[PDB]
Coordinates of C-alpha atoms and ligand atoms in Angstrom, one line a residue:
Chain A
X1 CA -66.9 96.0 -30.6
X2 CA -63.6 97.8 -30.2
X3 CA -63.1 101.6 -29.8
X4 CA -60.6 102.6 -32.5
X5 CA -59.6 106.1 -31.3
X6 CA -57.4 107.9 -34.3
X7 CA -57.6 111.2 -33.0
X8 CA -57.0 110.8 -29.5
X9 CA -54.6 108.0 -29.9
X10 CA -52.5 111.0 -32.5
X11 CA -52.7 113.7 -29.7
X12 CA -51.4 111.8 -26.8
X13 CA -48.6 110.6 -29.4
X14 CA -47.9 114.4 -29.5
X15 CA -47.5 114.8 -26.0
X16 CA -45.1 112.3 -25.5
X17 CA -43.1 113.6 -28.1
X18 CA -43.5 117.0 -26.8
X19 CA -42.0 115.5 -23.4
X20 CA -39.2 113.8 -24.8
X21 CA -38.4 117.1 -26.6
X22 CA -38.5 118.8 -23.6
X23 CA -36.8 116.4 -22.0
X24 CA -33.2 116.9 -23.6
X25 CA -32.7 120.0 -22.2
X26 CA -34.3 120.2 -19.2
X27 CA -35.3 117.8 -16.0
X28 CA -38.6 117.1 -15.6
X29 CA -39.2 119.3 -12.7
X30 CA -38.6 122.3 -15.2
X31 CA -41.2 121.4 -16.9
X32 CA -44.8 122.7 -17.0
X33 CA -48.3 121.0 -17.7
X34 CA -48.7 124.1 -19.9
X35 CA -45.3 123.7 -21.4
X36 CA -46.5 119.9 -22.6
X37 CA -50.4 121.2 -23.7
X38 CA -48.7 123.9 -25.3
X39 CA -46.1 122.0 -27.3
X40 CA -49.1 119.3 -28.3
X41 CA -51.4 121.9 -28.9
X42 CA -54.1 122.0 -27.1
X43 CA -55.1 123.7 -24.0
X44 CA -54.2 122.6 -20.4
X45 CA -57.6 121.8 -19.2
X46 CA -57.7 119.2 -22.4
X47 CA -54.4 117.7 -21.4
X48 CA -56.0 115.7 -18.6
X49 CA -58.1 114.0 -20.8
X50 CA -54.6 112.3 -22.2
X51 CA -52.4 112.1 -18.6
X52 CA -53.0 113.0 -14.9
X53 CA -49.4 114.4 -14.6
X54 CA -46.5 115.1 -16.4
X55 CA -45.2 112.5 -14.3
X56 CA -47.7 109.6 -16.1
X57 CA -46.3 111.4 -19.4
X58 CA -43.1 110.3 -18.0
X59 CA -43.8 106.8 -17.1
X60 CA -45.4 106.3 -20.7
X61 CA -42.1 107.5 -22.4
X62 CA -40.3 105.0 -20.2
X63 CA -42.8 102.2 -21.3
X64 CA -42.5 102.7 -24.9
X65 CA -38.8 102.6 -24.7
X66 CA -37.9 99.8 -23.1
X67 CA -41.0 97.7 -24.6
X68 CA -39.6 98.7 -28.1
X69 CA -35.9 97.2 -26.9
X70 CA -38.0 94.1 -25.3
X71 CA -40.0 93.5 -28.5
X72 CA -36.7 94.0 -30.7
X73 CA -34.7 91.4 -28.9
X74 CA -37.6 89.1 -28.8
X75 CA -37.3 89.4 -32.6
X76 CA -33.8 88.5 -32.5
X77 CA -34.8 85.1 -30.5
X78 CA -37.6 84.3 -33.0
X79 CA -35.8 84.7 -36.5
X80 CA -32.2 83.2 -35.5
X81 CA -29.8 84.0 -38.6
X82 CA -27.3 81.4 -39.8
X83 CA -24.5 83.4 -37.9
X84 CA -21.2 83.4 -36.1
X85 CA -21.3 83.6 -32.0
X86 CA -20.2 87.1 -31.7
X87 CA -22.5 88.7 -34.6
X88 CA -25.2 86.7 -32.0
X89 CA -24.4 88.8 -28.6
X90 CA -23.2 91.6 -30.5
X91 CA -26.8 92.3 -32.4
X92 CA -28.6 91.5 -28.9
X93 CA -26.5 93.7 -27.5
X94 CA -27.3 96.1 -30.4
X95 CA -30.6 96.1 -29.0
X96 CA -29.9 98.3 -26.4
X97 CA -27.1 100.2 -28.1
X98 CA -29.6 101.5 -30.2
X99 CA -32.9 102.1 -28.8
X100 CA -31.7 103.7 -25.9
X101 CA -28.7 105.5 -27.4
X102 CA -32.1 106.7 -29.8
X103 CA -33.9 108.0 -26.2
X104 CA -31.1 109.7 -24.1
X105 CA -33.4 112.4 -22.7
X106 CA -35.4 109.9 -21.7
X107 CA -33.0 107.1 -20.6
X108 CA -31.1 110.0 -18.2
X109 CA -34.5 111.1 -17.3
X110 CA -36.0 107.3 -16.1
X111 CA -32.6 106.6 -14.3
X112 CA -33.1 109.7 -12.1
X113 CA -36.6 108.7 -11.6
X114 CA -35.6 105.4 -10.2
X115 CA -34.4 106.8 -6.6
X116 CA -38.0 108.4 -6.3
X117 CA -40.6 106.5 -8.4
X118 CA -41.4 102.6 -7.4
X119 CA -43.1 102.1 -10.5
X120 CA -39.9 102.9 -12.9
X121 CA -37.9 100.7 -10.2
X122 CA -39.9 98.0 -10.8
X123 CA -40.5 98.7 -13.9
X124 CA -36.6 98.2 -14.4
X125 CA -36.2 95.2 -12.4
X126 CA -39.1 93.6 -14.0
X127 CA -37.5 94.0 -17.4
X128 CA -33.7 93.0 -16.4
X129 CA -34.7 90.1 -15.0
X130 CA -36.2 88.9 -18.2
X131 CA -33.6 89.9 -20.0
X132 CA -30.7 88.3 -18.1
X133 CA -33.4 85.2 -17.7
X134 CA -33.0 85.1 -21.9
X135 CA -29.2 85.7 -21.4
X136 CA -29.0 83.0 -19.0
X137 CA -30.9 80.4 -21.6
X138 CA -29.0 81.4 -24.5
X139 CA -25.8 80.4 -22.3
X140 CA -27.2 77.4 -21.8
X141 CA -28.2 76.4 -25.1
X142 CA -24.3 76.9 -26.0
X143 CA -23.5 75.2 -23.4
X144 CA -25.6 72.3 -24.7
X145 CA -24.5 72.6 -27.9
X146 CA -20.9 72.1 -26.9
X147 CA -19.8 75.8 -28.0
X148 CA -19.4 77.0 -24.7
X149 CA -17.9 75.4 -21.5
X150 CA -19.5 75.0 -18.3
X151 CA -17.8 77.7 -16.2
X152 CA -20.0 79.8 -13.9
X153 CA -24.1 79.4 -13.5
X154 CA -25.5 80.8 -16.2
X155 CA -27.7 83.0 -14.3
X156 CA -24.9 84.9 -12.4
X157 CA -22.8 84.9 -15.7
X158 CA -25.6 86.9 -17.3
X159 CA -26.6 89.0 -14.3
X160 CA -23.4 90.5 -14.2
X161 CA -23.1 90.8 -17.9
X162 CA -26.2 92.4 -18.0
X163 CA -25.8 95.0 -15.0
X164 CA -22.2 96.0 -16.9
X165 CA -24.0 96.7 -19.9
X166 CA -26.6 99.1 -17.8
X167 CA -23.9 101.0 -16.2
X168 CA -21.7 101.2 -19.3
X169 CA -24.1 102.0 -21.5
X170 CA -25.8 104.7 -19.5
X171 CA -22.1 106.3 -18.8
X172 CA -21.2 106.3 -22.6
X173 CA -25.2 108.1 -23.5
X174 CA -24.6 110.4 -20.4
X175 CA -21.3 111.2 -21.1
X176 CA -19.8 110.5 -17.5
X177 CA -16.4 110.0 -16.8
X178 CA -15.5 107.5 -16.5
X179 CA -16.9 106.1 -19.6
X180 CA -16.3 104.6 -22.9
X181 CA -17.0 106.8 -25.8
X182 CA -20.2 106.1 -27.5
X183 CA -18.0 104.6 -30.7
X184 CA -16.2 102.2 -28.9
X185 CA -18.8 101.0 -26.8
X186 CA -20.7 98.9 -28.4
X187 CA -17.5 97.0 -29.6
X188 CA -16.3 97.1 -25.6
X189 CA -19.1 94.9 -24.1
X190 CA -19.4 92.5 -27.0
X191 CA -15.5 91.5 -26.2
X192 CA -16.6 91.1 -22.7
X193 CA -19.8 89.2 -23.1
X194 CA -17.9 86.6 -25.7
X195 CA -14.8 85.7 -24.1
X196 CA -16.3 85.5 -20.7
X197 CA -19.4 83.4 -21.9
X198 CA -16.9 81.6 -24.4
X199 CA -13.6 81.3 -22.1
X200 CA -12.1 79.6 -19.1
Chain B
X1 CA -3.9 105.0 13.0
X2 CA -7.3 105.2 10.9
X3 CA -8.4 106.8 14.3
X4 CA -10.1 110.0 13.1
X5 CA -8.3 113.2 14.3
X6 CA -10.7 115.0 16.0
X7 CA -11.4 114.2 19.5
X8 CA -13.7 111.0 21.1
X9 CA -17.0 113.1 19.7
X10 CA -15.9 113.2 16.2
X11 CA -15.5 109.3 16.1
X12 CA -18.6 108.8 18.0
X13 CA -20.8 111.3 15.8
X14 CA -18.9 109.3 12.8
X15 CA -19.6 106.0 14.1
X16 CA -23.5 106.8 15.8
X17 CA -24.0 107.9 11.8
X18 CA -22.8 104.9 10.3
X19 CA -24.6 103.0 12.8
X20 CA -28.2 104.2 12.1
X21 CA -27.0 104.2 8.5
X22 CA -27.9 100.5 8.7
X23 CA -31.8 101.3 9.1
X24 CA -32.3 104.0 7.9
X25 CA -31.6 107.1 5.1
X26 CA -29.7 110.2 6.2
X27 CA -32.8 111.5 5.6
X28 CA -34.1 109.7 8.7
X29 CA -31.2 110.6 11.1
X30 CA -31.5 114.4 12.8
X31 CA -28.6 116.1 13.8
X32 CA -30.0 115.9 17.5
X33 CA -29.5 111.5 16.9
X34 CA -25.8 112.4 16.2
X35 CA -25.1 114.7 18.8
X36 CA -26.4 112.4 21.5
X37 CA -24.6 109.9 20.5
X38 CA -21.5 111.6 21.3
X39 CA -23.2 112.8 24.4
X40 CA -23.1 116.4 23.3
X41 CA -26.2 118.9 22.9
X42 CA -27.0 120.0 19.2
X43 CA -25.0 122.9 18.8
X44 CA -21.9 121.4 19.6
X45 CA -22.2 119.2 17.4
X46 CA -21.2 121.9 15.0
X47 CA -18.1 122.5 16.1
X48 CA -17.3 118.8 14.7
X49 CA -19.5 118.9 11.5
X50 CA -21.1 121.9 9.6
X51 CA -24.1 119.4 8.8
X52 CA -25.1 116.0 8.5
X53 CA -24.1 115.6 4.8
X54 CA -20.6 116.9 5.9
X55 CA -20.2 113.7 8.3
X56 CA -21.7 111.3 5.2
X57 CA -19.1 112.8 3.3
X58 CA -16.0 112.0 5.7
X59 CA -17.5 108.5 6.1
X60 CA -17.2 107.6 2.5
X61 CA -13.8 109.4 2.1
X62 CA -13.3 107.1 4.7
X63 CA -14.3 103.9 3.2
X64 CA -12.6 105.0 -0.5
X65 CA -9.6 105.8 1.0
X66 CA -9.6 102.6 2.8
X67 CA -10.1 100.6 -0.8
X68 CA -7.4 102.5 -2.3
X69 CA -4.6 101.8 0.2
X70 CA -5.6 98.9 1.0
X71 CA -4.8 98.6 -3.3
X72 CA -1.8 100.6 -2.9
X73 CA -0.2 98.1 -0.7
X74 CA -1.1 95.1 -2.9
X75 CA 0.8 97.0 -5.8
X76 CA 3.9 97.4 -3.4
X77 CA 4.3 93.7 -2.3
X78 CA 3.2 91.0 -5.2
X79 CA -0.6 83.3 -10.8
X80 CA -2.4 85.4 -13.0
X81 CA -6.3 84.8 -11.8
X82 CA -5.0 85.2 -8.1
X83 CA -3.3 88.6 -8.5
X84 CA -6.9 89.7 -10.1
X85 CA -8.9 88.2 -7.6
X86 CA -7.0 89.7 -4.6
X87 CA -7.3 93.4 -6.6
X88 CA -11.3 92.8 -6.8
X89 CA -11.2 91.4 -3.3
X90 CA -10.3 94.6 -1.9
X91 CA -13.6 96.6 -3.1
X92 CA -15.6 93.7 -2.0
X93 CA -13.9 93.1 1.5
X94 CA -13.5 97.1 1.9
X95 CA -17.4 98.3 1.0
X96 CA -18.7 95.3 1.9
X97 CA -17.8 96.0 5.1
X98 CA -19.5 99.5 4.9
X99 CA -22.7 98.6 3.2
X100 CA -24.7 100.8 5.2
X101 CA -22.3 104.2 4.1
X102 CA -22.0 102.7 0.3
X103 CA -25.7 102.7 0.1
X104 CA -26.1 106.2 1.7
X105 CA -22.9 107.4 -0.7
X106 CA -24.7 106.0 -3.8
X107 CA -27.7 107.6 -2.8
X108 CA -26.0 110.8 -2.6
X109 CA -24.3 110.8 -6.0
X110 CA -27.8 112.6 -7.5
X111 CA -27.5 115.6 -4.9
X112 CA -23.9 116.2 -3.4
X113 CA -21.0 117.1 -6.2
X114 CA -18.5 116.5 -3.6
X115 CA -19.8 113.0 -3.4
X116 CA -20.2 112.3 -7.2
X117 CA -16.7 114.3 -7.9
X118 CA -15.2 112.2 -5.0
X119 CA -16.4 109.1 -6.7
X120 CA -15.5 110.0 -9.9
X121 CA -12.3 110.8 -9.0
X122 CA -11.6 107.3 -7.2
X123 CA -12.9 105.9 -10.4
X124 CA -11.3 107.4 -12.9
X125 CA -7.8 106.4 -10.4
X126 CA -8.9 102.8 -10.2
X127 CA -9.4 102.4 -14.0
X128 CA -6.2 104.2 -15.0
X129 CA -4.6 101.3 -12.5
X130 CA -6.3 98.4 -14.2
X131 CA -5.1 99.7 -17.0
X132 CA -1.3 100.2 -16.4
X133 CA -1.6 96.5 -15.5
X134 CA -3.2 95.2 -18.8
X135 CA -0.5 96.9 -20.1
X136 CA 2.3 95.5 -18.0
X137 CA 0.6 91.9 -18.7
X138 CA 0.4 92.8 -22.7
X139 CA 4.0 94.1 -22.8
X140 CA 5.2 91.1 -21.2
X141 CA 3.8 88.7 -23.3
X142 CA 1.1 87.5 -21.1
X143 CA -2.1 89.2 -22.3
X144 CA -2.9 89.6 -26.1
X145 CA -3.9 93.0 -27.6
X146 CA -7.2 93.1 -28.3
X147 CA -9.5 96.4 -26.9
X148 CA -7.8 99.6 -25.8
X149 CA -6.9 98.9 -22.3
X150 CA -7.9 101.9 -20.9
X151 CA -11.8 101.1 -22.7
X152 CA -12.1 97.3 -21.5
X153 CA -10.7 98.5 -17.9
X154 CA -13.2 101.2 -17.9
X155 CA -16.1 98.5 -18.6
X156 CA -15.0 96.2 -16.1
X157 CA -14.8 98.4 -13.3
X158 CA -18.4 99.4 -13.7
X159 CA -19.6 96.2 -13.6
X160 CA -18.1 95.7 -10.3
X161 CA -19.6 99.1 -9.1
X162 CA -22.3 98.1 -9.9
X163 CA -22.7 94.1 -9.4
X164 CA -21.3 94.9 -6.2
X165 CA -23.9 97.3 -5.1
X166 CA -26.6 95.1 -6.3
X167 CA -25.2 92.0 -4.2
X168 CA -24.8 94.6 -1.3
X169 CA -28.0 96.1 -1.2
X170 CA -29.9 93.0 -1.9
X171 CA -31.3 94.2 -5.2
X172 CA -33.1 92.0 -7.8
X173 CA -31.6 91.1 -10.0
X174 CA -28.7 90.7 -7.9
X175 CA -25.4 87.8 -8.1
X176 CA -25.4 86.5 -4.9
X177 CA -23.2 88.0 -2.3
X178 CA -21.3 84.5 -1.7
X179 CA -21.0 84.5 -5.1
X180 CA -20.2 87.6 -6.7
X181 CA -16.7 88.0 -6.2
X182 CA -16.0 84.4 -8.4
X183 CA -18.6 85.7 -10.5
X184 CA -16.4 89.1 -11.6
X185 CA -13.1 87.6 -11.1
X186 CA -14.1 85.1 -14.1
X187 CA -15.0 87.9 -15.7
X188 CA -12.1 89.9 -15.9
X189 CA -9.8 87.6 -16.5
X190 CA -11.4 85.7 -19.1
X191 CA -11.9 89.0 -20.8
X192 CA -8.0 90.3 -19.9
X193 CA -6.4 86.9 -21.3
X194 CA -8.7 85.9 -24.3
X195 CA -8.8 86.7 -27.9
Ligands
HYV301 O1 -30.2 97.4 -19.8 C1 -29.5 97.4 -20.7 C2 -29.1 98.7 -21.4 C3 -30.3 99.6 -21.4 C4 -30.0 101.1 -21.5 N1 -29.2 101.4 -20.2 C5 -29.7 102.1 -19.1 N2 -29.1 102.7 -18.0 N3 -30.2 103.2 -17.1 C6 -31.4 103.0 -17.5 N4 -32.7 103.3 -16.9 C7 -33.0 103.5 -15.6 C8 -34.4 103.7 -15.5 C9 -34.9 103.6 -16.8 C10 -33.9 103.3 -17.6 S1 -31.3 102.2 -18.9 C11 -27.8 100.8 -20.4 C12 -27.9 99.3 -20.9 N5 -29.0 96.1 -21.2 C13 -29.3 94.8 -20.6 C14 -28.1 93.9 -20.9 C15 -27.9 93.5 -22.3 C16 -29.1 92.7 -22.7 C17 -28.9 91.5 -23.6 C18 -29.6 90.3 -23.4 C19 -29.5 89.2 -24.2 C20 -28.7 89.2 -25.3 C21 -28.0 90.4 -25.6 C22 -28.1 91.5 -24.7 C23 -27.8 94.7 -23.1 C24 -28.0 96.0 -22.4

């Protein structure tokens, strides 16, 4: 037997997309359990029979993001095109380009929760270090392939490359300064990534 | 010299803070801490400092004016991946050798606009340097013209903020600290000087 759950499975959607909206234009501590029932329509009392906190609503919004830019670059390394090296990087780069440049409320709003929360941290850090460990063996197979020289370890190569594209990215969907504008960004870290994992 | 100006009890309130820094948050460090390090009871500690964040501050305009003279002299007195090593080796030698006040300063960023305006500030000076110099190499003939300058150099210099700090602070995932300076020089120059 499995429990489907429709309705209940619908609302909570609701609520998270009640929170994101909330989210882009004001921190989470501005806003109210009442202000997320509210927005999803139902009373307060019923909202705890979706999250405990708005701070669970919080930590859901973060999972679904970065679990939709996991699952999309895991579709990249299962259905490899017949492609050129920097179309490669540059549409795994994509990846994050574009699912997080989708969620800026919620990327600004998970990268202020990582000084206080230990779950988001490591929520994070469990999710770079896959990433860069996929960077690390695509280096290598281009290595192995003789497309790419044997220059640094790959795993430092793509740590770094992968903790510029955090930063850089984050700068360019907060709208720092310094940063790259968002229309040059993308264009930016692919130059990197490709003559640094291509060059000596 | 870099003595502070103040008196003995200004450099040993800077220095006691800098030295719990290592163990602990500001957070964790009372005023009272301070002033007995400098062998002074708590109010007179305030004719040094209005506050504990006020002697955070002065330690990391400390540190970031360190890294940019210690840059300022290299561009007075001059092989292609040495000149960018030695640039990048002045951030790692110069906060490196602060870990304890980068970590606090970084933490800081989220709540003190002197401290994320005094970052920015150094930043947005370090980048415009980096990016006189790609242009200096390009108009020479050494460097071919691929991104805007000023867009690559920005790039680069966040990865070293933050590859640096993640070496510093032990993060995971991290490049090892032995490591991390090859690691970024590669980098930067593979990314400066290929097409
Ligand atoms: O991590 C990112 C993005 C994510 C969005 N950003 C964030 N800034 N703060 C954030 N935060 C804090 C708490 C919650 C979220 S997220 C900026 C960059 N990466 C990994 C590196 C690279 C991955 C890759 C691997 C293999 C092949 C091609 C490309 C592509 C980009």
């Amino acid at each position: 037997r499995r429990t489907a759950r429709p309705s209940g499975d619908d609302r909570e959607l609701a609520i998270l997309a009640t929170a994101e909206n909330l989210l882009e234009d004001r921190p989470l501590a501005d806003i109210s359990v009442d202000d997320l029932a509210k927005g999803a329509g139902i009373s307060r009392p019923t909202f705890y029979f979706y999250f405990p906190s708005k701070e669970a609503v919080l930590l859901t919004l973060l999972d679904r993001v970065v679990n939709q830019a996991d699952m999309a670059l895991q579709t990249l390394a299962e259905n490899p095109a017949d492609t050129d090296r920097e179309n490669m990087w540059r549409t795994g780069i994509n990846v994050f380009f574009e699912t997080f440049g989708s969620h800026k409320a919620v990327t600004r709003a998970g990268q202020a929760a990582r000084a206080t929360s230990v779950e988001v941290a490591e929520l994070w850090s469990t999710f770079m270090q896959k990433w860069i460990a996929y960077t690390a063996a695509v280096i290598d197979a281009e290595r192995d392939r003789g497309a790419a020289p044997r220059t640094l370890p790959a795993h430092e190569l793509a740590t770094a490359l992968n903790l510029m594209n955090e930063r850089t990215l984050f700068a360019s969907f907060a709208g720092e300064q310094p940063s790259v504008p968002e229309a040059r960004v993308l264009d930016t870290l692919v130059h990197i990534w490709v003559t640094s994992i291509y060059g000596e």
